Amino acid sequence: GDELYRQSLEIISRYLREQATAGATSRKALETLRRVGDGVQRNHETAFQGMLRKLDIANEDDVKSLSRVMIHVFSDGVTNWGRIVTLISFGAFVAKHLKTINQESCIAPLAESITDVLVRTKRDWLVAQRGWDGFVEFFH
Ligand SMILES: CS(=O)(=O)NC(=O)c1[nH]c2cc(Cl)ccc2c1CCCOc1cccc2ccccc12
Ligand SMILES: CS(=O)(=O)NC(=O)c1[nH]c2cc(Cl)ccc2c1CCCOc1cccc2ccccc12
Numbered sequence: 001g002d003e004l005y006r007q008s009l010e011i012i013s014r015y016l017r018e019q020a021t022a023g024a025t026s027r028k029a030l031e032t033l034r035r036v037g038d039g040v041q042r043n044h045e046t047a048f049q050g051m052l053r054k055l056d057i058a059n060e061d062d063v064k065s066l067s068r069v070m071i072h073v074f075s076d077g078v079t080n081w082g083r084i085v086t087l088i089s090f091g092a093f094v095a096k097h098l099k100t101i102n103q104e105s106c107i108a109p110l111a112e113s114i115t116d117v118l119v120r121t122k123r124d125w126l127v128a129q130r131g132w133d134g135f136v137e138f139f140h
């Protein structure tokens with residue numbers, strides 16, 4: 001299979017779903033993402049609220065449009081765990097919004113889309129970092 005994709009989809013999907021409601025690397029990475037991601041979201045509440053209101057997300061077609069938006073984030077050439085975890089954290093903020101507006105059916109597609117953009121765009125950097133073990137190390 002594709003173990004990095006499997007792990008990434010499991011970690012990101014679980015964190016996003018937890019906004020509405022396994023191997024050791026995945027458990028430790030989800031613990032880390034909860035702790036770090038919740039802090040990122042708290043420290044960005046006002047900023048995330050402002051951008052989200054401009055995105056104007058009401059349904060699955062709006063959520064689908066975010067794939068190309070996320071690909072454009074990585075176009076600045078910045079690759080580090082801070083940028084990656086903050087991208088995931090705004091995704092979680094969107095998932096909370098999808099819960100509020102009764103569009104939870106869009107959360108698993110959103111998590112797959114974040115996973116797809118991250119692993120297609122940054123596969124080779126993620127592998128060099130040893131993946132989610134690198135993530136756990138960075139944020140310890
Ligand atoms: C697919 S597109 O070309 O039609 N639209 C965008 O890429 C797009 N749409 C946005 C809507 C809002 Cl509300 C905000 C931003 C956009 C974007 C730009 C996407 C890339 O933005 C960034 C690029 C690089 C770093 C960033 C850091 C923090 C936030 C955004 C960053
Ligand atoms: C670590 S940083 O200092 O470089 N900051 C970010 O990476 C950053 N800052 C943000 C501010 C807002 Cl208001 C919203 C998002 C960010 C981010 C993360 C990179 C931009 O992410 C996105 C930007 C635009 C739309 C997105 C939709 C789904 C998931 C992420 C999206």
Ligand SMILES: Oc1ccccc1-c1cc(C(F)(F)C(F)F)[nH]n1
Binds near residue numbers: 039082083086138140
């Ligand atoms: O919360 C942490 C614990 C240990 C090491 C680093 C962090 C951390 C870094 C960031 C960030 F803001 F820089 C974000 F960009 F990742 N948030 N939390």
